[PDB]
Short mmCIF file of all heavy atoms in Angstrom, two decimals:
data_model
loop_
_atom_site.label_atom_id
_atom_site.label_comp_id
_atom_site.label_asym_id
_atom_site.label_seq_id
_atom_site.Cartn_x
_atom_site.Cartn_y
_atom_site.Cartn_z
N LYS D 381 0.82 -1.26 0.01
CA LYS D 381 0.11 -0.03 -0.05
C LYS D 381 0.86 1.23 0.03
O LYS D 381 1.50 1.59 1.07
CB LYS D 381 -1.02 -0.02 1.18
CG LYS D 381 -1.93 1.31 1.24
CD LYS D 381 -2.63 1.65 -0.07
CE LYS D 381 -3.35 2.97 0.19
NZ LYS D 381 -3.74 3.59 -0.97
N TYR D 382 0.93 1.88 -1.17
CA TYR D 382 1.46 3.30 -1.39
C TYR D 382 0.35 4.28 -0.95
O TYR D 382 -0.67 4.34 -1.49
CB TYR D 382 1.74 3.43 -2.91
CG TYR D 382 2.54 4.55 -3.46
CD1 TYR D 382 3.75 4.44 -3.85
CD2 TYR D 382 1.77 5.72 -3.49
CE1 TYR D 382 4.46 5.48 -4.41
CE2 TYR D 382 2.42 6.92 -3.85
CZ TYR D 382 3.76 6.86 -4.42
OH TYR D 382 4.53 7.85 -4.87
N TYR D 383 0.71 4.99 0.13
CA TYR D 383 -0.20 6.22 0.59
C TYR D 383 0.13 7.53 0.10
O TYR D 383 -0.80 8.42 0.01
CB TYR D 383 -0.06 6.16 2.12
CG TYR D 383 -0.82 5.07 2.89
CD1 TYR D 383 -0.21 3.98 3.35
CD2 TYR D 383 -2.23 5.23 3.01
CE1 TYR D 383 -0.79 2.90 4.09
CE2 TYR D 383 -3.04 4.19 3.79
CZ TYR D 383 -2.29 3.10 4.31
OH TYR D 383 -2.97 2.16 4.93
N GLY D 384 1.34 7.77 -0.36
CA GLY D 384 1.82 9.03 -0.86
C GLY D 384 3.16 9.59 -0.20
O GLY D 384 3.67 8.90 0.73
N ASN D 385 3.57 10.69 -0.58
CA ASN D 385 5.02 11.38 -0.31
C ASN D 385 6.13 10.36 -0.32
O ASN D 385 6.70 10.20 -1.48
CB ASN D 385 4.87 12.07 1.06
CG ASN D 385 6.02 12.84 1.42
OD1 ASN D 385 7.03 12.37 2.03
ND2 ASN D 385 6.27 14.01 0.85
N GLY D 386 6.41 9.56 0.70
CA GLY D 386 7.42 8.49 0.65
C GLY D 386 6.87 7.10 1.22
O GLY D 386 7.66 6.29 1.25
N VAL D 387 5.58 7.08 1.55
CA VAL D 387 5.04 5.93 2.33
C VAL D 387 4.59 4.77 1.34
O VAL D 387 3.65 5.02 0.61
CB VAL D 387 3.87 6.31 3.22
CG1 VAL D 387 3.51 5.20 4.06
CG2 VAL D 387 4.37 7.47 4.15
N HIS D 388 5.35 3.59 1.41
CA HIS D 388 4.89 2.44 0.69
C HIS D 388 4.91 1.21 1.66
O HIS D 388 5.66 0.32 1.60
CB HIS D 388 5.98 2.24 -0.50
CG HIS D 388 6.45 3.45 -1.18
ND1 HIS D 388 5.69 4.61 -1.53
CD2 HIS D 388 7.83 3.75 -1.40
CE1 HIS D 388 6.62 5.50 -1.92
NE2 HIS D 388 7.88 5.16 -1.84
N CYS D 389 3.83 1.20 2.50
CA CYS D 389 3.68 0.14 3.54
C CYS D 389 3.43 -1.23 3.13
O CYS D 389 2.80 -1.47 2.06
CB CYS D 389 2.41 0.53 4.35
SG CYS D 389 2.42 2.15 5.25
N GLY D 390 4.09 -2.27 3.72
CA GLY D 390 3.80 -3.59 3.53
C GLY D 390 3.18 -4.26 4.87
O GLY D 390 2.02 -4.71 4.72
N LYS D 391 4.00 -4.35 5.86
CA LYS D 391 3.57 -4.72 7.28
C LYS D 391 4.11 -4.09 8.41
O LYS D 391 3.48 -3.64 9.34
CB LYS D 391 3.80 -6.32 7.36
CG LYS D 391 5.21 -6.79 7.26
CD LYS D 391 5.26 -8.26 7.35
CE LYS D 391 6.75 -8.79 7.27
NZ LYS D 391 6.78 -10.37 7.21
N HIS D 392 5.58 -3.69 8.39
CA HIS D 392 6.27 -2.92 9.27
C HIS D 392 7.15 -1.85 8.65
O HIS D 392 8.23 -1.34 9.15
CB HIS D 392 6.99 -3.86 10.29
CG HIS D 392 8.01 -4.91 9.66
ND1 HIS D 392 8.43 -6.02 10.20
CD2 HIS D 392 8.68 -4.77 8.59
CE1 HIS D 392 9.24 -6.58 9.51
NE2 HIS D 392 9.51 -5.90 8.41
N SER D 393 6.77 -1.44 7.46
CA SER D 393 7.70 -0.95 6.38
C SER D 393 7.24 0.24 5.71
O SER D 393 7.81 0.69 4.57
CB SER D 393 7.95 -2.11 5.36
OG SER D 393 6.68 -2.78 5.09
N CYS D 394 6.27 0.94 6.15
CA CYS D 394 5.76 2.31 5.76
C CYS D 394 6.85 3.29 5.49
O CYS D 394 7.46 3.82 6.43
CB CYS D 394 4.78 2.87 6.81
SG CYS D 394 3.28 1.90 6.93
N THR D 395 7.41 3.36 4.21
CA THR D 395 8.75 3.66 3.90
C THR D 395 9.24 5.06 4.36
O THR D 395 10.34 4.93 4.96
CB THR D 395 9.11 3.39 2.41
OG1 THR D 395 8.45 2.30 1.92
CG2 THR D 395 10.69 3.13 2.24
N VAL D 396 8.71 6.19 4.01
CA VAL D 396 9.21 7.51 4.20
C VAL D 396 10.59 7.74 3.47
O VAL D 396 10.56 8.41 2.46
CB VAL D 396 9.56 7.89 5.71
CG1 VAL D 396 9.75 9.41 5.97
CG2 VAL D 396 8.37 7.45 6.62
N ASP D 397 11.68 7.11 3.84
CA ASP D 397 13.01 6.80 3.31
C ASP D 397 13.65 5.76 4.19
O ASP D 397 14.83 5.40 3.86
CB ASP D 397 13.77 8.20 3.21
CG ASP D 397 14.22 8.78 4.57
OD1 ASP D 397 13.43 9.36 5.29
OD2 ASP D 397 15.41 8.64 4.90
N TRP D 398 13.05 5.46 5.38
CA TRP D 398 13.74 4.68 6.51
C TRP D 398 12.92 3.53 7.01
O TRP D 398 13.21 2.97 8.09
CB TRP D 398 14.18 5.66 7.57
CG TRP D 398 13.34 6.23 8.71
CD1 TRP D 398 13.82 6.88 9.69
CD2 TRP D 398 11.96 6.02 9.03
NE1 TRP D 398 12.96 7.04 10.76
CE2 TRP D 398 11.77 6.37 10.32
CE3 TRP D 398 10.92 5.41 8.24
CZ2 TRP D 398 10.60 6.07 10.94
CZ3 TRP D 398 9.65 5.21 8.87
CH2 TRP D 398 9.49 5.56 10.31
N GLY D 399 11.95 3.04 6.31
CA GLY D 399 11.04 1.96 6.62
C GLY D 399 11.69 0.60 6.76
O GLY D 399 11.19 -0.27 7.56
N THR D 400 12.88 0.43 6.18
CA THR D 400 13.89 -0.66 6.47
C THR D 400 14.38 -0.55 7.91
O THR D 400 14.67 -1.61 8.50
CB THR D 400 15.14 -0.61 5.44
OG1 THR D 400 15.58 0.67 5.42
CG2 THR D 400 14.48 -0.93 4.00
N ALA D 401 14.82 0.63 8.40
CA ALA D 401 15.16 0.84 9.87
C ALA D 401 14.08 0.38 10.81
O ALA D 401 14.37 -0.58 11.69
CB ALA D 401 15.50 2.34 10.05
N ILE D 402 12.89 1.02 10.80
CA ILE D 402 11.78 0.63 11.67
C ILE D 402 11.38 -0.81 11.50
O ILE D 402 11.21 -1.61 12.53
CB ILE D 402 10.54 1.53 11.60
CG1 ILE D 402 10.08 1.75 10.24
CG2 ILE D 402 10.94 2.90 12.38
CD1 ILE D 402 8.62 2.15 10.11
N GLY D 403 11.45 -1.36 10.28
CA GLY D 403 11.27 -2.82 10.11
C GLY D 403 12.22 -3.75 10.61
O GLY D 403 11.81 -4.72 11.24
N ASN D 404 13.50 -3.41 10.57
CA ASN D 404 14.63 -4.18 11.21
C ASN D 404 14.60 -4.12 12.73
O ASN D 404 14.59 -5.27 13.33
CB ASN D 404 15.90 -3.63 10.67
CG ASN D 404 17.11 -4.28 11.44
OD1 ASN D 404 17.42 -5.45 11.04
ND2 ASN D 404 17.93 -3.60 12.12
N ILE D 405 14.36 -2.89 13.41
CA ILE D 405 14.13 -2.70 14.77
C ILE D 405 12.96 -3.62 15.35
O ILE D 405 13.01 -4.47 16.22
CB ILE D 405 13.95 -1.25 15.03
CG1 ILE D 405 15.33 -0.45 14.82
CG2 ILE D 405 13.39 -1.00 16.54
CD1 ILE D 405 15.18 0.99 14.66
N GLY D 406 11.76 -3.49 14.64
CA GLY D 406 10.66 -4.32 14.86
C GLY D 406 10.94 -5.87 14.78
O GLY D 406 10.52 -6.61 15.65
N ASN D 407 11.63 -6.38 13.72
CA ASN D 407 12.03 -7.73 13.63
C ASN D 407 13.05 -8.22 14.58
O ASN D 407 13.10 -9.45 14.94
CB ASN D 407 12.30 -8.16 12.18
CG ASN D 407 11.71 -9.47 11.78
OD1 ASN D 407 11.24 -9.71 10.67
ND2 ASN D 407 11.87 -10.58 12.56
N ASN D 408 13.94 -7.35 15.22
CA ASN D 408 14.88 -7.68 16.18
C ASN D 408 14.23 -7.79 17.59
O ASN D 408 14.51 -8.70 18.30
CB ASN D 408 15.93 -6.51 16.22
CG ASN D 408 17.16 -6.78 15.44
OD1 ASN D 408 18.15 -7.26 15.92
ND2 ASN D 408 17.03 -6.65 14.13
N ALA D 409 13.07 -7.08 17.82
CA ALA D 409 12.15 -7.37 19.00
C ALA D 409 11.60 -8.74 18.73
O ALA D 409 11.61 -9.65 19.62
CB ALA D 409 11.15 -6.27 19.07
N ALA D 410 11.06 -8.94 17.48
CA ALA D 410 10.56 -10.31 17.17
C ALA D 410 11.66 -11.52 17.05
O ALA D 410 11.39 -12.64 16.85
CB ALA D 410 9.76 -10.26 15.83
N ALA D 411 12.98 -11.21 17.24
CA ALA D 411 14.08 -12.14 17.37
C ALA D 411 14.78 -12.06 18.76
O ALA D 411 15.75 -12.78 18.99
CB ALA D 411 14.92 -12.17 16.15
N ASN D 412 14.35 -11.36 19.65
CA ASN D 412 14.04 -11.80 20.99
C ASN D 412 13.15 -12.97 20.86
O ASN D 412 13.49 -14.06 21.38
CB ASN D 412 13.65 -10.76 22.02
CG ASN D 412 14.65 -9.64 22.38
OD1 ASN D 412 15.12 -9.41 23.45
ND2 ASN D 412 15.08 -8.96 21.36
N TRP D 413 11.99 -12.81 20.14
CA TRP D 413 10.91 -13.87 19.93
C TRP D 413 10.17 -14.11 21.22
O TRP D 413 8.91 -14.29 21.24
CB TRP D 413 11.36 -15.03 19.21
CG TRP D 413 10.45 -15.71 18.35
CD1 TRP D 413 10.51 -17.18 18.24
CD2 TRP D 413 9.35 -15.35 17.49
NE1 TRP D 413 9.48 -17.47 17.21
CE2 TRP D 413 8.84 -16.36 16.70
CE3 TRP D 413 8.75 -14.02 17.10
CZ2 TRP D 413 8.05 -16.32 15.64
CZ3 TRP D 413 7.86 -13.88 16.04
CH2 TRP D 413 7.56 -15.00 15.33
N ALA D 414 10.78 -14.14 22.44
CA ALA D 414 10.59 -13.52 23.64
C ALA D 414 10.15 -12.04 23.56
O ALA D 414 9.58 -11.50 24.53
CB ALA D 414 11.66 -13.76 24.62
N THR D 415 10.37 -11.30 22.42
CA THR D 415 9.65 -10.06 22.12
C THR D 415 10.17 -8.85 22.78
O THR D 415 9.39 -8.22 23.64
CB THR D 415 8.10 -10.40 22.15
OG1 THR D 415 7.85 -11.36 21.10
CG2 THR D 415 7.20 -9.15 21.57
N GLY D 416 11.36 -8.30 22.40
CA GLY D 416 11.90 -7.22 23.09
C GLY D 416 12.20 -7.28 24.63
O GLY D 416 12.49 -6.31 25.30
N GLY D 417 12.07 -8.48 25.19
CA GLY D 417 12.00 -8.88 26.65
C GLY D 417 10.48 -8.96 27.19
O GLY D 417 10.46 -9.11 28.44
N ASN D 418 9.55 -9.10 26.33
CA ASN D 418 8.11 -9.34 26.74
C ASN D 418 7.99 -10.55 27.71
O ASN D 418 7.37 -10.48 28.76
CB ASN D 418 7.20 -9.44 25.48
CG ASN D 418 5.81 -9.48 25.75
OD1 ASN D 418 5.22 -8.46 26.21
ND2 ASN D 418 5.14 -10.60 25.61
N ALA D 419 8.61 -11.66 27.37
CA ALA D 419 8.61 -12.82 28.14
C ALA D 419 9.77 -12.85 29.18
O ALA D 419 10.15 -13.99 29.66
CB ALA D 419 8.58 -14.12 27.17
N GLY D 420 10.49 -11.78 29.38
CA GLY D 420 11.75 -11.73 30.14
C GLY D 420 13.11 -12.12 29.44
O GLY D 420 14.11 -12.09 30.02
N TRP D 421 13.03 -12.70 28.15
CA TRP D 421 13.96 -13.34 27.32
C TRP D 421 14.98 -14.27 28.15
O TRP D 421 16.19 -14.07 28.07
CB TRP D 421 14.79 -12.20 26.48
CG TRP D 421 15.56 -12.68 25.36
CD1 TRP D 421 15.40 -13.53 24.51
CD2 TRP D 421 16.91 -12.07 24.98
NE1 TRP D 421 16.37 -13.61 23.53
CE2 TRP D 421 17.31 -12.72 23.79
CE3 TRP D 421 17.76 -11.10 25.50
CZ2 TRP D 421 18.57 -12.41 23.06
CZ3 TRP D 421 18.99 -10.75 24.83
CH2 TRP D 421 19.39 -11.48 23.64
N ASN D 422 14.40 -15.08 28.96
CA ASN D 422 15.09 -16.01 29.84
C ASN D 422 16.07 -16.97 29.26
O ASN D 422 15.67 -17.79 28.38
CB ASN D 422 14.04 -16.69 30.73
CG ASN D 422 14.84 -17.62 31.87
OD1 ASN D 422 14.90 -18.76 31.68
ND2 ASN D 422 15.25 -17.06 32.91
N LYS D 423 17.38 -16.81 29.56
CA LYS D 423 18.50 -17.72 29.11
C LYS D 423 19.45 -18.01 30.11
O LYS D 423 19.77 -19.26 30.33
CB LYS D 423 19.19 -16.92 27.86
CG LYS D 423 18.38 -16.96 26.57
CD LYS D 423 19.23 -16.19 25.46
CE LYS D 423 18.48 -16.25 24.11
NZ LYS D 423 18.34 -17.62 23.50
#
């Protein structure tokens, strides 16, 4: 979904010029997978 200006959204990726940054940060929380420390990331 292209919204205008620089925004070309997929799922975490609403582009601007930096939607790869917020997308990567989002998936790094999702690779705690315990979720940014949501489950305490117990190891």
Side-chain angles (χ1 to χ4, degrees):
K381 177 55 183 164
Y382 189 113
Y383 283 104
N385 188 265
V387 184
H388 327 318
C389 299
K391 63 187 183 183
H392 59 205
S393 44
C394 292
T395 322
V396 192
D397 72 283
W398 89 170
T400 51
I402 51 159
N404 178 67
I405 290 162
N407 220 135
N408 267 265
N412 295 236
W413 208 214
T415 299
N418 191 67
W421 195 42
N422 183 260
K423 288 181 175 288

